[PDB]
Amino acid sequence: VQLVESGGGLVKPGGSLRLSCVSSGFTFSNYWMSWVRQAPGGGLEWVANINQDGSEKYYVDSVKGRFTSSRDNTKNSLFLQLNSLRAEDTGIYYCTRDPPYFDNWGQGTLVTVSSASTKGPSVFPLAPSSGGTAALGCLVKDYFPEPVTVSWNSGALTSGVHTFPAVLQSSGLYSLSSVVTVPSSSLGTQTYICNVNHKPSNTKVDKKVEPK
Amino acid sequence: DVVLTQSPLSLPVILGQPASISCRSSQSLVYSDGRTYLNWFQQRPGQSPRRLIYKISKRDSGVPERFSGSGSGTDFTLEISRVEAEDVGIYYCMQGSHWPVTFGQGTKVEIKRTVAAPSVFIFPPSDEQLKSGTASVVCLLNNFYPREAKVQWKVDNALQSGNSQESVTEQDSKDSTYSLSSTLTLSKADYEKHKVYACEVTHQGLSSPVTKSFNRG
Amino acid sequence: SSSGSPPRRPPPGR
Description:
The structure holds 3 protein chains of 3 kinds. Chain A is an all-beta fold. Chain A has 2 domains: 2-113, Immunoglobulin-like, CATH 2.60.40; 122-209, Immunoglobulins (Immunoglobulin-like, Sandwich). Chain A is built from no helices and 19 strands. Chain A has strands at 2-6, 10-11, 17-24, 33-38, 44-50, 57-59, 67-72, 77-82, 91-97, 104-105, 109-113, 122-126, 133-143, 149-152, 161-163, 167-168, 174-183, 192-198, 203-209. In chain A, strands 2, 4, 5, 6, 9, 10 and 11 form a 7-stranded mixed beta sheet that branches. In chain A, a hairpin with a 6-residue loop joins strand 12 (122-126) and strand 13 (133-143). Chain B is mainly beta. Chain B has 2 domains: 4-112, Immunoglobulin-like, CATH 2.60.40; 119-215, Immunoglobulin-like. Helix content of chain B is 5%, strand content 50%. Chain B has 2 helices and 19 strands. Chain B has helices spanning 127-132, 188-191; strands at 4-7, 10-14, 19-25, 38-43, 50-54, 58-59, 67-72, 75-80, 89-95, 102-103, 107-112, 119-123, 134-144, 150-155, 158-159, 164-168, 178-187, 196-202, 210-215. In chain B, strands 2, 4, 5, 6, 9, 10 and 11 form a 7-stranded mixed beta sheet that branches. A 4-stranded antiparallel beta sheet of chain B has the order 1-3-8-7, with no helix packed on it. Chain B has a 4-stranded antiparallel beta sheet with strand order 12-13-17-16. In chain B, a hairpin with a 2-residue loop joins strand 14 (150-155) and strand 15 (158-159). Chain C is low in regular secondary structure. The A-C interface holds A 32, 49, 56, 58, 99-101 and C 6-10. It is classed as immune system. Keywords: Autoantigen, EBV, Antibody, immune system. The assembly is trimeric. The entry is titled "EBNA1 peptide AA386-405 with Fab MS39p2w174".
């Protein structure tokens, strides 16, 4: 059983946004579905319920009148329309199955309500130089909004990786670093590539990081 | 709306010890069909919540047996018979008996491990970045415990303030350590105006503040 | 003694 959300992104206040959720692994037509959101630095808030055929739709009071649901059982798909977006609507929107049990959740999609504009990231190497362990990384600077995903050697390098949480710079743009610690004796032997992804700005960087 | 109060909100546990998270409801929580719709969710770092318990005590199929639930009426409990390193995360209780369904604040479970000193690394900016007119120098503190650490930047032994900002990772699910990156941002002109760049790290695992420095070029 | 009927819609009279 799988639930996949999409449609989250940057939207100016007052604007509109359409979220979708595609399900797998169960008879979609038999279950009530629900949306739950998670505020920044906060917990969980229930948002919406929808019937098996979409005939019944209920919403949390803080969004009554602004959000509308729809459902398409021929495509195992659930939808949520967000209108007149407020700043407090920012958060991760999760697609969940079978309220009030919420036995399965999607990975979520991020809604950022902001007047700011999308910015592409600048990817710069954090080179290692001269014990028995070398640290090397990648600097992903001046991007907006979130998220950014970093991987090393296309996922082949996982142990020792730390991709830090982003920080909001005084400029109003985010910046994070992804580091990995590796044996110093494998700097002139193993190649290290950081794979940066910023889908909001359609940016994909594969930068080789080498010493000196 | 029913208010779900969790206690404690921060729960640092020695590895292997039992743990208990309390959830106190503002109302009776027993529905008209006799059932009590109280759930427990686990949000591990970087992931979405996943249900642990439904209806007070019924455990999900994919949840390890060391998780259990109890309670009735307005007092409920999530029990962990043995806290493993992978149990770090935020635990929410949720009620569905009253409209609308509401969650508790969440209890952050933290492993209390033995002190570890931060391995400290400093990174001069990249030639490509200076080509762009800005200089960011990064200081990395890797796999340390406890979380509390202080990083100070000095250019030519001059204390800095207002130009740097730091970021710390969530507790690692394997070695229960943290990691911190502190980035100092300067202009290319200011950068090429000084020679020595250093971050000074003070931590419980260090007897004296360790300094990592480089000389521009 | 009731059977199971989970609450999925708001109560009447909101």
